Amino acid sequence: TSIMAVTFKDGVILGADSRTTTGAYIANRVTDKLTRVHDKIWCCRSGSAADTQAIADIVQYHLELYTSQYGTPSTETAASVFKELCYENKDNLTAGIIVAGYDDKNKGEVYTIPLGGSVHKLPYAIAGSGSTFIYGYCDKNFRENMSKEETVDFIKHSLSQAIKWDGSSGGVIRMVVLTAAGVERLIFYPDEYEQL
């Protein structure tokens, strides 16, 4: 994997490639690594497909139950539930999860949860095998309060480079826009992003 989430003026955008590997064989070249845990709380998954999937399914259950009793959960709450699972089962999991969501009070928020099970709230976050290659780029090109179109370009260019160097990353770039407007799914094919 290459995955990232970026806050901006109107909310937050999650981005991800679509490559799933079993060794050097590509098991699935059109994978959806962007998964919904609530209306406007989504996460990007890196590491073990089985572990991140089972975690995400449990989190979705917890937030559905939270919603029925206490109303819409904060993005921070969602991240805390991810953490509780990742931290307490750290010996049995290989999951690097980025959480992103849109409140109306708090706007766009991004929380990253690396292998240890620690939580880190950030303006933007990168993760997965391909993220190593774009630390320099993303640090140099990220600004706060970007526009939607600026943020889409930032993610598209960033993941393009990650994909270009990381063999474990590739295929299409999927993105998910989280704003007051609603939820927008985006997709960008190789022919477009390769020659950026």
Partner: protein
């Protein structure tokens, strides 16, 4: 005992009615890092042989130097160096096969899989494989790495046995090869879009095509796939 560092992935090849085709992408991987992107892994020897090499690139470069030196040595005191006593594909192959097996026998292999494609002086097509173990075999279609698993099945639908070779044209054969290179780009995590292709024909000679790309790729169906089971948004 080695471990390969900078590597090249699949080399694919097949026979057709008048000649042979061979192709290989232009990537030099460094583990999962796609480090180098201008690597030529098809090396012609004279105008009647192409050697395609996969595996460790430092050992490939060494083999390049051997073949280049072989041409020089063959020319020495040889008035018929560009005629009756020119290097044949069978000569070049057996030399490499000899070297490979000696190196494995001294527990110091050249960490490669090689396919020698060419046309003999009598018009016969030559296509034979050799690897780090010194194992050799011949077939109407040959491939290394992932190529063996994904290309061969496709190429064998064209030439399934010896008798299918006269029936196969260069247009059909090249199409199958280019299609195979696309499939490998879809499914091999250490492949690249850019590749080189070489035809050795008994009439038209050696055509060496560089800077080819995989095109006509189906990706559009991706926009319909959501989640991993129960997701609808």
């Amino acid at each position: 005992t080695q471990q390969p560092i900078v590597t090249g992935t699949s080399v694919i090849s097949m026979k057709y009615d008048n000649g042979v085709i061979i192709a290989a992408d232009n990537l030099g991987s460094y583990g999962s890092l796609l480090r180098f992107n201008g690597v030529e892994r098809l090396i012609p020897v004279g105008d009647n042989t192409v050697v395609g090499i996969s595996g460790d690139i430092s050992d490939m470069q060494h083999i390049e130097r051997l073949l280049k030196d072989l041409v020089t040595e063959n020319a020495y005191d040889n008035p018929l160096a560009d005629a009756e006593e020119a290097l044949e594909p069978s000569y070049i192959f057996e030399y490499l096969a000899t070297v490979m097996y000696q190196r494995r026998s001294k527990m110091n292999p050249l960490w490669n899989a090689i396919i020698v494609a060419g046309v003999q002086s009598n018009g016969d097509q030559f296509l034979r494989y050799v690897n780090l173990l010194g194992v050799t075999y011949s077939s109407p279609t040959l491939a290394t790495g992932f190529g063996a698993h994904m290309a061969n099945p496709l190429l064998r639908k064209v030439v399934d046995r010896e008798s299918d070779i006269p029936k196969t044209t260069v247009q059909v054969a090249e199409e199958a090869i280019v299609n195979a290179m696309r499939v490998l780009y879809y499914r091999d995590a250490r492949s690249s879009r850019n590749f080189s292709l070489a035809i050795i024909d008994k009439n038209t000679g050696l055509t060496f095509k560089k800077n080819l790309q995989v095109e006509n790729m189906k990706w559009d169906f991706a926009k319909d796939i959501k989640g991993y089971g129960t997701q609808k948004i």
